[PDB]
Amino acid sequence: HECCFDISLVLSSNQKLVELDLSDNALGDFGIRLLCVGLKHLLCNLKKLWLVSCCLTSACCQDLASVLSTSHSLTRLYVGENALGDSGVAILCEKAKNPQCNLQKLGLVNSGLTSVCCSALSSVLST
Amino acid sequence: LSTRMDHMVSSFCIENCHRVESLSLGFLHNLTSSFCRGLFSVLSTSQSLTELDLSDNSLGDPGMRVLCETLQHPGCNIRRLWLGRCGLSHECCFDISLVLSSNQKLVELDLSDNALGDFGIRLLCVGLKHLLCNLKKLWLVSCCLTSACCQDLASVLSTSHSLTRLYVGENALGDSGVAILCEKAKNPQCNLQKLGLVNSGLTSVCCSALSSVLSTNQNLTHLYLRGNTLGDKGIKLLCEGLLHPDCKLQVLELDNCNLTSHCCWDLSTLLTSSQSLRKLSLGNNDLGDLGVMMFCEVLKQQSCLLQNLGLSEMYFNYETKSALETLQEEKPELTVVFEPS
Amino acid sequence: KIEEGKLVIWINGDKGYNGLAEVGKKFEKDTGIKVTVEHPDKLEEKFPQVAATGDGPDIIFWAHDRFGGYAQSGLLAEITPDKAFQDKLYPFTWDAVRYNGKLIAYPIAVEALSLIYNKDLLPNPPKTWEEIPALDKELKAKGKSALMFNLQEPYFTWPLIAADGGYAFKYENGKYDIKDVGVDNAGAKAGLTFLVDLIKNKHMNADTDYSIAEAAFNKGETAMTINGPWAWSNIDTSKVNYGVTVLPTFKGQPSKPFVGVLSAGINAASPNKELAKEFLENYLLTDEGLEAVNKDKPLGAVALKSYEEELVKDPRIAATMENAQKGEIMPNIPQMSAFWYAVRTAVINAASGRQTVDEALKDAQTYRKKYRKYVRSRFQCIEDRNARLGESVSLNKRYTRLRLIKESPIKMELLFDPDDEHSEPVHTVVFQGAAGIGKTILARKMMLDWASGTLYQDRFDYLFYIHCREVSLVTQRSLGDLI
Ligand SMILES: C[C@H](CCC(=O)NCCC[N+](C)(C)CCCS(=O)(=O)[O-])[C@H]1CC[C@H]2[C@@H]3[C@H](O)C[C@@H]4C[C@H](O)CC[C@]4(C)[C@H]3C[C@H](O)[C@]12C
Numbered sequence: 031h032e033c034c035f036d037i038s039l040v041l042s043s044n045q046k047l048v049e050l051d052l053s054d055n056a057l058g059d060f061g062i063r064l065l066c067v068g069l070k071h072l073l074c075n076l077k078k079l080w081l082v083s084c085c086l087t088s089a090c091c092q093d094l095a096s097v098l099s100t101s102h103s104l105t106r107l108y109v110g111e112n113a114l115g116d117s118g119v120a121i122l123c124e125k126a127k128n129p130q131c132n133l134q135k136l137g138l139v140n141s142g143l144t145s146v147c148c149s150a151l152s153s154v155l156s157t
Numbered sequence: 158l159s160t161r162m163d164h165m166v167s168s169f170c171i172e173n174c175h176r177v178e179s180l181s182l183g184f185l186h187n188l189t190s191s192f193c194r195g196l197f198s199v200l201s202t203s204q205s206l207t208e209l210d211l212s213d214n215s216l217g218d219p220g221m222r223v224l225c226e227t228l229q230h231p232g233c234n235i236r237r238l239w240l241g242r243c244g245l246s247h248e249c250c251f252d253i254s255l256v257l258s259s260n261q262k263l264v265e266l267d268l269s270d271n272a273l274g275d276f277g278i279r280l281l282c283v284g285l286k287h288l289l290c291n292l293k294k295l296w297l298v299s300c301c302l303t304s305a306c307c308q309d310l311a312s313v314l315s316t317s318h319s320l321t322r323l324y325v326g327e328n329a330l331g332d333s334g335v336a337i338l339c340e341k342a343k344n345p346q347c348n349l350q351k352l353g354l355v356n357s358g359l360t361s362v363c364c365s366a367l368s369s370v371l372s373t374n375q376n377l378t379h380l381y382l383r384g385n386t387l388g389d390k391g392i393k394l395l396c397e398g399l400l401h402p403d404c405k406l407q408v409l410e411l412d413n414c415n416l417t418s419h420c421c422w423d424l425s426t427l428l429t430s431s432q433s434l435r436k437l438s439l440g441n442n443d444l445g446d447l448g449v450m451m452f453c454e455v456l457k458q459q460s461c462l463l464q465n466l467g468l469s470e471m472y473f474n475y476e477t478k479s480a481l482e483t484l485q486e487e488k489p490e491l492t493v494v495f496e497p498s
Numbered sequence: 499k500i501e502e503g504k505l506v507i508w509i510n511g512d513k514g515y516n517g518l519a520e521v522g523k524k525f526e527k528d529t530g531i532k533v534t535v536e537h538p539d540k541l542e543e544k545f546p547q548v549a550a551t552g553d554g555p556d557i558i559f560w561a562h563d564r565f566g567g568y569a570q571s572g573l574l575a576e577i578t579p580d581k582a583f584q585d586k587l588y589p590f591t592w593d594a595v596r597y598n599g600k601l602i603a604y605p606i607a608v609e610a611l612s613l614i615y616n617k618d619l620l621p622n623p624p625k626t627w628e629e630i631p632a633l634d635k636e637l638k639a640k641g642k643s644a645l646m647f648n649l650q651e652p653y654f655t656w657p658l659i660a661a662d663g664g665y666a667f668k669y670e671n672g673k674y675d676i677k678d679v680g681v682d683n684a685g686a687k688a689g690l691t692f693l694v695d696l697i698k699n700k701h702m703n704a705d706t707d708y709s710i711a712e713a714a715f716n717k718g719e720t721a722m723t724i725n726g727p728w729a730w731s732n733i734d735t736s737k738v739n740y741g742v743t744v745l746p747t748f749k750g751q752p753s754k755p756f757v758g759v760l761s762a763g764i765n766a767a768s769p770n771k772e773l774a775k776e777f778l779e780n781y782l783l784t785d786e787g788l789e790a791v792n793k794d795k796p797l798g799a800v801a802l803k804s805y806e807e808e809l810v811k812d813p814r815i816a817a818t819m820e821n822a823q824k825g826e827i828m829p830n831i832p833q834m835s836a837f838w839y840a841v842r843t844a845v846i847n848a849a850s851g852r853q854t855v856d857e858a859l860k861d862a863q864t865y866r867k868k869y870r871k872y873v874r875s876r877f878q879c880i881e882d883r884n885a886r887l888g889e890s891v892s893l894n895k896r897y898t899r900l901r902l903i904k905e906s907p908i909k910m911e912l913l914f915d916p917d918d919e920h921s922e923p924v925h926t927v928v929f930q931g932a933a934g935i936g937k938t939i940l941a942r943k944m945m946l947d948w949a950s951g952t953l954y955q956d957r958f959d960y961l962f963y964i965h966c967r968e969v970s971l972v973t974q975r976s977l978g979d980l981i
């Protein structure tokens with residue numbers, strides 16, 4: 031998570047970076063909290079973000095959801111192989127359902143999702 | 158506060174209070190939860206509250222986040238925030254930084270005795286280097302810091318228009334650490350007034366860096382080095398700085414610093430040479446039974462030292478005690494010397 | 499409060515006060531501006547307070563050393579003589595009043611410690627310090643001493659100590675180097691060592707004070723002593739045919755006494771800068787001005803070049819100035835208060851109680867180590883007494899290990915540690931065994947091993963041996979067995 035601060039600084043000023051893959055790193059929920067600072071910042075043109083297998087839990091979805099809500103450029107979000115269980119997905123969905131969200135590809139691959147969270151995904155798919 | 162009943166009662170009374178200047182809470186075996194959230198939501202609106210003391214109780218990071226949100230309120234008006242042994246980690250530093258970046262009322266922040274490791278400092282410095290941060294006093298005592306963090310603290314000292322009090326003792330900010338802080342504290346435009354390098358494992362090697370700061374930085378009035386094994390060589394080097402005509406240091410505290418008899422010459426020189434020094438707190442060190450007699454003799458010639466002369470926690474003989482008592486009576490302008498008894 | 503319109507002078511009443519007033523009155527008649535001279539007691543204590551207020555005198559007459567303190571406080575005005583005036587006074591006295599490159603006072607008179615001798619016992623004083631021992635032996639045969647002086651006051655020992663290159667504070671570019679002290683180097687050590695040897699050889703005692711040295715000289719027990727011009731007035735009552743000369747040399751070098759220069763400083767807050775300057779420059783610092791002063795009370799050697807030539811008629815004055823020329827200007831930095839203490843505790847203790855090499859060595863004897871070494875030495879021998887077929891040292895390496903068991907074998911180390919657990923340490927340990935089993939030998943070995951740093955290095959700072967053979971049960975005493 032320590033490096034997420036420095037990554038955030040890059041996102042805040044480097045307008046050329048489009049695709050960033052941070053998969054398989056210990057960027058725990060705190061690390062996400064920091065990356066989201068850069069991701070929610072104007073001038074960040076990041077389109078693809080991979081956070082697969084990053085020791086994340088549902089807690090981090092509170093910040094990722096905000097990124098999905100306000101980011102004008104983020105279209106690809108992969109957060110599989112994490113502990114983003116039903117409650118985490120529901121949080122993301124509450125913002126991803128917004129007609130103005132630019133999310134195009136959602137990688138909730140292996141996050142312990144169950145039948146309960148499917149109504150949240152249904153909402154997103156419908157809207 | 159012990160139970161939920163106490164929270165609603167305290168909340169009621171504090172909310173309906175228009176003249177409380179300082180509040181001290183002590184959460185017991187309830188936090189690390191939103192349990193205290195109800196009260197913090199009240200503190201945000203108390204226009205008369207200037208000091209909030211949350212020290213020596215377990216305030217888990219999540220709790221610090223809640224507090225930080227409540228400190229971003231337009232009507233917060235809290236000027237002093239004390240967060241001693243709260244059990245905070247580097248995680249909370251992010252949230253603290255956010256408060257510093259927008260809360261223009263906070264002046265004194267005490268983060269002592271928390272695990273705000275070097276990384277945590279890196280984050281706090283984001284807020285500290287930010288405009289609108291009016292923080293004047295910052296305590297980072299015993300925060301598991303190492304010399305690495307000085308790279309960021311030094312930048313704060315360089316650019317901050319407001320930080321005057323910095324206490325970073327009880328850490329591993331050794332010779333290399335302080336040297337970094339000094340390089341920037343050296344700048345004539347640095348606003349540092351009180352430097353609390355109390356117990357950082359400093360040695361004689363780094364005293365040339367402190368000397369440089371003392372020589373150039375005319376805003377530095379208090380320097381606390383007690384607990385650092387500076388040695389006699391250390392004092393010699395510090396004195397070269399202190400004897401510089403532009404040095405304005407008023408208070409120098411030197412408790413146990415592994416001192417011996419030799420340094421008495423340099424300390425004696427300091428006592429009569431500096432026109433700026435007012436207080437010299439030599440403490441628990443083997444100053445020497447004869448060494449102090451030199452102080453007794455020289456502190457008669459219109460010395461500018463008025464305050465604590467130290468010599469506490471030090472064994473003296475009969476004649477020495479008599480001489481010190483005589484000095485105290487003959488020169489009343491010297492408030493108190495402070496022998497052991 | 500500034501005393502505008504008049505010039506006010508403060509001077510010690512033991513100086514040529516009436517004379518200085520005459521210079522003032524002459525000045526008034528010549529210029530029309532009145533000069534008032536006053537002599538309050540402890541002017542050196544009151545002046546700093548009025549000077550710091552703006553009140554008080556325009557001109558201050560006192561020793562140039564104290565003036566350095568005023569200069570540090572900024573209580574003195576800078577003086578601005580041109581070279582036309584600077585060249586009127588001796589070329590070495592301008593340093594007496596120089597503070598960090600600035601001139602703060604006008605030199606008036608120069609004191610030095612000259613050699614005062616009795617022509618009836620010694621019409622021809624020695625020119626070399628090394629000759630005094632021989633002179634003393636010859637005089638002792640006659641029943642007289644060659645040299646006696648105050649050795650309890652470093653002021654009078656310095657001339658010899660500094661003779662071989664020793665110095666107080668280095669004086670390089672007009673500023674004294676505070677961190678460079680010459681009392682430690684070989685030049686000082688050689689001088690002090692020689693002096694201490696003179697005491698050990700019984701040419702001088704260690705406890706002679708001012709009164710004893712003067713009494714012995716005025717009585718006729720000594721060929722000579724060392725003093726300054728300030729004491730000459732008490733040397734006439736003896737009716738001794740005394741003379742004053744230049745002190746003996748040491749290894750080719752002249753002695754270097756502290757030179758005490760009387761000077762006239764000016765108050766920082768006074769507007770009478772041109773007035774005070776002209777008063778001092780063209781009236782007081784003249785042959786006529788100095789005669790007016792000297793007429794009331796002799797100044798001894800004077801800063802004026804021409805006036806000293808006029809006074810050359812008196813060899814005592816000429817010798818004083820010659821000594822001053824060869825001497826050392828007494829530093830005006832407040833660090834001298836530390837210096838004076840440093841030498842006071844150097845010479846007296848060096849004379850008796852320790853060596854001259856020990857004296858400068860940071861008080862390395864911190865007692866703890868002194869005792870440890872005392873024990874280390876004392877217990878090197880198994881008995882350290884008589885009865886060993888010639889009293890040879892047996893050498894404690896002969897110690898043969900004894901078996902120690904608790905009432906598995908144990909070591910002498912860890913002896914006082916807590917047992918298995920309970921965090922319970924032991925204060926009292928008892929070693930029992932038959933007479934002749936080695937009880938005392940073990941105790942002596944233990945102390946030797948401790949003193950050598952091979953046992954209980956961290957646990958005990960002191961071991962105090964109590965020999966029950968020596969301690970009686972009926973003799974009254976405090977816990978002085980420690981001594
Ligand atoms: C003023 C000087 C300090 C400066 C100094 O000494 N400067 C040069 C040294 C290094 N050099 C390499 C140039 C030469 C080495 C000498 S060597 O002989 O090794 O060649 C030092 C040197 C010895 C010091 C006294 C003794 O401590 C005993 C005692 C200790 C007490 O607490 C305080 C009182 C007292 C009387 C002390 C006073 C003072 O403090 C002295 C005169």
Ligand SMILES: Nc1ncnc2c1ncn2[C@@H]1O[C@H](COP(=O)(O)OP(=O)(O)O)[C@@H](O)[C@H]1O
Pocket residue numbers: 880896897898899900932933934935936937938939940
């Ligand atoms: N290695 C040794 N260890 C112990 N005692 C020794 C040793 N060699 C010689 N001796 C002798 O044994 C005697 C021991 O005396 P000890 O009984 O300990 O005296 P005390 O009665 O004073 O305690 C002394 O005569 C001593 O010199």
Ligand SMILES: CCc1nn(CC(=O)Nc2ccncn2)c(=O)c2cc3sccc3n12
Pocket residue numbers: 932933934935
């Ligand atoms: C040879 C005599 C002797 N014997 N012992 C053994 C002993 O004393 N045993 C017990 C047992 C019970 N009660 C008392 N003593 C010694 O220890 C001893 C020491 C010293 S010196 C000179 C002879 C001597 N000696």
